[PDB]
Structure formats: structure tokens, C-alpha cells
């Protein structure tokens, strides 16, 4: 009876909108009892089966639906979503393209197709397909919010205010109707949403994990209440899909091996397979135990292994980023679960007990922004492995080509030995900076850069062109190895002016907004002999930024763009800039560590979100309170002063140059000891039985 099965199929659609997925599944199947050949019920059922993570069972029904109706457009589109979640992008494209073939005005299919182009880096095509979907279905929250992020990625500030209005309007309506918001938690930091809306957005994405774990019907775990089974050692589990060539490893790859084995037994749970890099190699060897959970796709079994290792503190290092398997935390295999480092924001979820932060990043007055309890680190929660990865940048030398410290720079492990082979090396006391005069040796190095040569030899020492590290040693270029040659870095390599202030920002473009660019324009107008240095990410955003800078009165030559470089070249070429202008909307957390390691001052204006306060937290730990702006006017004044008071710039540059070593910012050994003290506070608190409480102290 297709008529009764139709009633059940419509009722299931209604229950499906209300979030009652279990009942929707029960109603779709009942419709399939009344009407076995119901192609619509097969497809709708497969959709909710996909929501519950039962992807293989969903595909089976999608194909059953398409066997019944070979021209079922909705089935191909929905099946495409299941294949994309399965990482089969070619299969998803073929499904999406087949659906749009059957129904040229299939708004959902165009939006889904646009998602592939977005994830592929084909932003212009994603924009085109999202606009097509909105042209066919102007009321399309998914297509609008993802289109809004595409425009954010390319810095297209076209009708920005109105676009923000509609975004906030869409989230408020979705939060009011208990629907999953179309704005991603990671992206919410970029839009003028209330802190309540941001946490609510997170809270509902954290609840999605339950839909995938409730069908597992697993009982709660029994957690250890003492350290007797682990010989008095606290068992700490680090879960991350980024144990490899990923920024997170570039920050904390030394921490596992630096844990005190007398008090701690470190477990590293990879959610990703081995990518063959030394980062992965290092963590697998220095951790007491390395568990590749990518081999255990089922969260139930994977959660069992975590609990069966006796973990006391489980650390979430992904949040809502790619590769995250938060379902493992929704099952609570560990008595204490904490967010740390990986994700700049609240989980908004129940299972996460703590979030590891600091007083500067997350002052107590904004406790309402987070679902977790605040667990303060002593200075800053952030950390980087720069001291271990890029030691050749601990010292530098320059070439007096006329004394600048960022026009022609020499770095190397054997730098002093090479300088000791030269008879005319001068020193400028600040650690003091050695200067090479414009002699025969100096002309030889300059000749290499202009001629584009890869490297030369002087007094037996190899002198490498900074632009050609990959051709010399690819391991050195990715930061896997330390470059064994003396590297030359010149402003001339990147078209930077030799006699002008260079304000830089190597952050991704989506972190810039119209207000931020306006600040930078005000700074450039006030410092005439200066230019802005930006990263081509994505390259199609370069023309967008220029046009707006052009509207604000800045010629196109005042904004210099460089391509994305290898890790080592990115961190090393930061030495060429005078100042770093941080992005207030969302701070460059890893980028700030790279810039600070190069001895480049960074100006920042901490906002209210966690992502907007990391830069201020790093400088507070570094000991440079004069680079933290309380409002936009102070942000510009601080930047203009560094570009026009060259004596003040020299003082502030030497301050960062010294304190990057003397302050705890890059001291991973100290950071690990402080993190261990914090871990024990959490366990001592758990030993008493107290519920997770704030560790602000």
C-alpha cells in the first residue's frame, strides 16, 4: 500500500526534522514493510542511517532506491554525501553530477557539489555552485553559510555587514528551532555571533557524536580511582589526528618524550595513519605507547582500547577540526578528559571536563563562554617546538651592504665557525649581532641570490640560497631535519624594499576582515616608508585585498604578496620583517610563534573569544606588554611608533630577540613540567571525588 507507506514516510520526515532520528528510522522501515519497493523510503532511511554513522547500511539502501528508480535525483545526491563522508570524493562527484543531470534545478545537489570544490581548493567554482543553489532556493542555510565562508576565505567583503546580519539571523533561527546550525564551530569565531551563540553552536555539534554512539548501546565505563594499577604513575592519553606533518606536531612533538617517566606514562592515540615523516617517527618512539586508532574505525572498539589501557587523563587535541573522532570522548573511556592546544575554543559539550588555557587567553570573567572548566597554565597554554626544530635561527648574522638587522641575514649551525674564517667580521652589541662588511665574500653571496644560484662554497663552508632549500634537503625544508648549511635570507628574494619598514602577516587570509584591513591601511598612511607583507592563501584573495586597499588610498605596490613556503622558509623569512601585525578577528596562534621565534615584534589587540586572545597571551609570556593594544587606536599607534621611531624599534626587536630564549614561551622542558603539575591537580581533585572545577587558582 503506497498510500499508507507514504503517510509513514511523511511522518518520518517530520520526526526527522524534530531531531527524533530513532523514530524516523522506525517509521521509514515501517513504510518499507507496507511498501517494499518504496524508493523514497529507502533513500530517506539511508540519510538517517548516515546520520547515525551506519554508512555501509546507508549505501545499501541508496542503491536499493536507485535500483527501483534509476532517475531518482534525491538518492544520487544523498548517496553522494555518504560517499564523501567515506572519503570517496570521485564517487561523490559522480553522484552529484548525475543528480544535477537528472534535475538541473536540484538546489541541494548544487550546494553539495559546491562542498567538494570548496574542500578541493576550487573556491571560485564552489562560490558559483553555492550561488546557483541560493538562486534556486534562496532560503538555504547550508548553502548560505558555506558560501559566506568561501567569501571569507578569499577576503570578498561584498555586502559584508548585511551578510553578517543574515548569518546571525540564520543561527538564531536554527538555535530557536533546535536544528543543527549551518555555521561550523571552528568558523563561528570569524562572525559577529554572541558568545552564547558560539557555545550553543559547539554544544549542538558535540551532541551529534551521541547520535553515532547511541546506536552502539555501550554502558558507561568504570574508571580507575587510584594509581596502584599503574605503579603510582598517571596515565595520560593524547588523542590527535595530527601526529605527523601538521602544525600541532610542530608545537608539541617534544612534550611526550619530555614527560617524567617516574610519575607519568604517556599514551599517544593517532587518529591518522603514518604519513612517513619524522614528526610521526619522533612521537611513536618517544611515547611510552603509540596506538594507531586509524586501524580501529569503530569508536566502540577504539573507546574500549583507551579504557583498557587504564587512561586517567584523556586529552582532546582536535576539537572540531579535520580528523577528529570526538565520539571516543562522548563514550568517556577516561575519568578526566581535557581540551588542549589543538582547538581554539570551547567544545560546548558535556564530556569534556577541562580546557587547558591561561589567565590571559581565558580570564575568569568570561567563564560563560566555555562549557568546560578553566584549567590555567602558569604562563601561557600555547607552546612551540621551535627551539628543537629551528635551532639554526637562535643566532644570525647580517651583511652591511651600504646597519640593518633584517635585509640580508645568514643563519646556520656552523655560523660562528664560518664567521671565524673571515678576517673582517664586526659585532653590534645588542646577544650581539655580527656584521659582514661589503667585501669580496659579501659580493659573492649577493651574486648567488641575484643570479638565482642554489648555493656556493666559501672557505669550505656551503652557503645555501634560502629560496632553494627543497632542492638541497627536503627534510630540512619541512622542519623534519635541521638545515646543515648556512642559509642566506634577503628581502630581495621576496621583492621587499631595502629602505622601508616591512609590516608582515603570514596568517591565512580568512582571518582578515574589513575592519582589520582598515587598521593596516591607517598604519601605512601614517608610516609612508612602509609596505604590507601578506601570504597568498588562497592566491585568489590577493586581487580582493588589493581592491579594498586601493579604495582606502594605498597603491598596489604597498602590499607585497609571497607564495606559501616550506615550514623552515616560512619561519626563517620572518627575520626580514620589522613588525608583525596580528589579526584581531582571529589571532595567528602558530603564526605568532613562528614570527616571535624570528625575533619579530608582533602587535595584537586581544578580543573576547579565545582565538582573538592567544596573541596577547603569547606576548604576555614573552614579556612584551607594550605590544598589546586595548583598542584599535592604540593598535595603530603602537604600530606607527615601531615604524617611525627606529630607536624604539631597535629596542623592541632586541627585546623579542632575547626573551624568546629567556622567557618560558619556547621552553618545552618547562612547559611539560608545568603541564604535569596541572595534570596532578586534576587527578588529586578526582581522587577526592570532586566534580571538575575551575583550576584558575
Amino acid at each position: 500500500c503506497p498510500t499508507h507507506a507514504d503517510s509513514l514516510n511523511n511522518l518520518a520526515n517530520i520526526k526527522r526534522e524534530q531531531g527524533n532520528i530513532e523514530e524516523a528510522v522506525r517509521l521509514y522501515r515501517k513504510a518499507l514493510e507496507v511498501f517494499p519497493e518504496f524508493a523514497a523510503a529507502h533513500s530517506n532511511l539511508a540519510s538517517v542511517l548516515q546520520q547515525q554513522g551506519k554508512l555501509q547500511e546507508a549505501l545499501m539502501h541508496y542503491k536499493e532506491a536507485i535500483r527501483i528508480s534509476p532517475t531518482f535525483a534525491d538518492a544520487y545526491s544523498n548517496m553522494g554525501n555518504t560517499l564523501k563522508e567515506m572519503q570517496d570524493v570521485q564517487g561523490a562527484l559522480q553522484c552529484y553530477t548525475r543528480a544535477i543531470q537528472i534535475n538541473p534545478a536540484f538546489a541541494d545537489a548544487h550546494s553539495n557539489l559546491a562542498s567538494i570544490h570548496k574542500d578541493s581548493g576550487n573556491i571560485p567554482e564552489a562560490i558559483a555552485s553555492y550561488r546557483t543553489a541560493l538562486k534556486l532556493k534562496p532560503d538555504f542555510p547550508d548553502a548560505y553559510c558555506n558560501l559566506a565562508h568561501c567569501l571569507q576565505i578569499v577576503c570578498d567583503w561584498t555586502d559584508y555587514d548585511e551578510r553578517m546580519k543574515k548569518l546571525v539571523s540564520i543561527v538564531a533561527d536554527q538555535l530557536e528551532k533546535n536544528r543543527l546550525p549551518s555555521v561550523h564551530p571552528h568558523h563561528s569565531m570569524l562572525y559577529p555571533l554572541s558568545h552564547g551563540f558560539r557555545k550553543a553552536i559547539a554544544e549542538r555539534h558535540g551532541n551529534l557524536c551521541l547520535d553515532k554512539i547511541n546506536v552502539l548501546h555501550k554502558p558507561p565505563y568504570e574508571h580507575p580511582k587510584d594509581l596502584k594499577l599503574s605503579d603510582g604513575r598517571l596515565r595520560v592519553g593524547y588523542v590527535s589526528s595530527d601526529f605527523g606533518n601538521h602544525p600541532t606536531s610542530h608545537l608539541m612533538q617534544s612534550i611526550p618524550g619530555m614527560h617524567n617517566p617516574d610519575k607519568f606514562e604517556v599514551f599517544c592515540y593517532a587518529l591518522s595513519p603514518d604519513d612517513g615523516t619524522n614528526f610521526r617517527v619522533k612521537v611513536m618512539a618517544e611515547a611510552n605507547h603509540f596506538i594507531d586508532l586509524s586501524q580501529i574505525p569503530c569508536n566502540g572498539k577504539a573507546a574500549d582500547r583507551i579504557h583498557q589501557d587504564g587512561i586517567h587523563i584523556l586529552v582532546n587535541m582536535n576539537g572540531y577540526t579535520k580528523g577528529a573522532r570526538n565520539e571516543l570522548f562522548a563514550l568517556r573511556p577516561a575519568p578526566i578528559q581535557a581540551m588542549w592546544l589543538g582547538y581554539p575554543g570551547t567544545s560546548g559539550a558535556l564530556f569534556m571536563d577541562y580546557i587547558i588555557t591561561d589567565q590571559e587567553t581565558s580570564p575568569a570573567e568570561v567563564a560563560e563562554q566555555y562549557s568546560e572548566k578553566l584549567a590555567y597554565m602558569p604562563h601561557t597554554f600555547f607552546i612551540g617546538d621551535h627551539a628543537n626544530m629551528f635551532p639554526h635561527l637562535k643566532k644570525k648574522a647580517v651583511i652591511d651592504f651600504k646597519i640593518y638587522d633584517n635585509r640580508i641575514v645568514l643563519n646556520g649551525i656552523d655560523l660562528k665557525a664560518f664567521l671565524d674564517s673571515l678576517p673582517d667580521v664586526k659585532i653590534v652589541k645588542m646577544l650581539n649581532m655580527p656584521v659582514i662588511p661589503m667585501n669580496t665574500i659579501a659580493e659573492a653571496v649577493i651574486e648567488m641570490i641575484n643570479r638565482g644560484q642554489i648555493q656556493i662554497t666559501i672557505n669550505g663552508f656551503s652557503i645555501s640560497n634560502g629560496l632553494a632549500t627543497t632542492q638541497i634537503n627536503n627534510k630540512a625544508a619541512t622542519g623534519e631535519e635541521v638545515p646543515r648549511t648556512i642559509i642566506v635570507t634577503t628581502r630581495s628574494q621576496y621583492g621587499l624594499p631595502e629602505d622601508a619598514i616591512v609590516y608582515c602577516n603570514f596568517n591565512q587570509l580568512y582571518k582578515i576582515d574589513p575592519s582589520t584591513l582598515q587598521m593596516w591601511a591607517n598604519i601605512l598612511k601614517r608610516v609612508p616608508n612602509s609596505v604590507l607583507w601578506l601570504l597568498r592563501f588562497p592566491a585568489v584573495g590577493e586581487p580582493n585585498i588589493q581592491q579594498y586597499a586601493q579604495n582606502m588610498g594605498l597603491p598596489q605596490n604597498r602590499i607585497i604578496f609571497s607564495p606559501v613556503a616550506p615550514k623552515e622558509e616560512h619561519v626563517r623569512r620572518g627575520q626580514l620583517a620589522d613588525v608583525c601585525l596580528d589579526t584581531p578577528l582571529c589571532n595567528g596562534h602558530t603564526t605568532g610563534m613562528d614570527v616571535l621565534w624570528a625575533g619579530t615584534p608582533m602587535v595584537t589587540m586581544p578580543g573576547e573569544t579565545l582565538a582573538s586572545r592567544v596573541a596577547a597571551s603569547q606576548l604576555t609570556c614573552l614579556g612584551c606588554l607594550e605590544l598589546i593594544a586595548k583598542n584599535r587606536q592604540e593598535y595603530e599607534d603602537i604600530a606607527v611608533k615601531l615604524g617611525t621611531d627606529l630607536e624604539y624599534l631597535k629596542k623592541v626587536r632586541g627585546k623579542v630577540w632575547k626573551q624568546r630564549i629567556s622567557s618560558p614561551l619556547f621552553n618545552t622542558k618547562q612547559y611539560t613540567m608545568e603541564l604535569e603539575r596541572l595534570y596532578l591537580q586534576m587527578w588529586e581533585h578526582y581522587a577526592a571525588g570532586n566534580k571538575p572545577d575551575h583550576m584558575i587558582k
Partner: peptide, 10 residues
């Protein structure tokens, strides 16, 4: 990983 939209057929 951009999200997608499922279609409910009526």
C-alpha cells in the same frame, strides 16, 4: 570537511 545537505523526498 564541509558539511552537506540531505534531501527528504515527499
Amino acid at each position: 570537511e564541509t558539511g552537506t545537505t540531505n534531501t527528504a523526498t515527499t
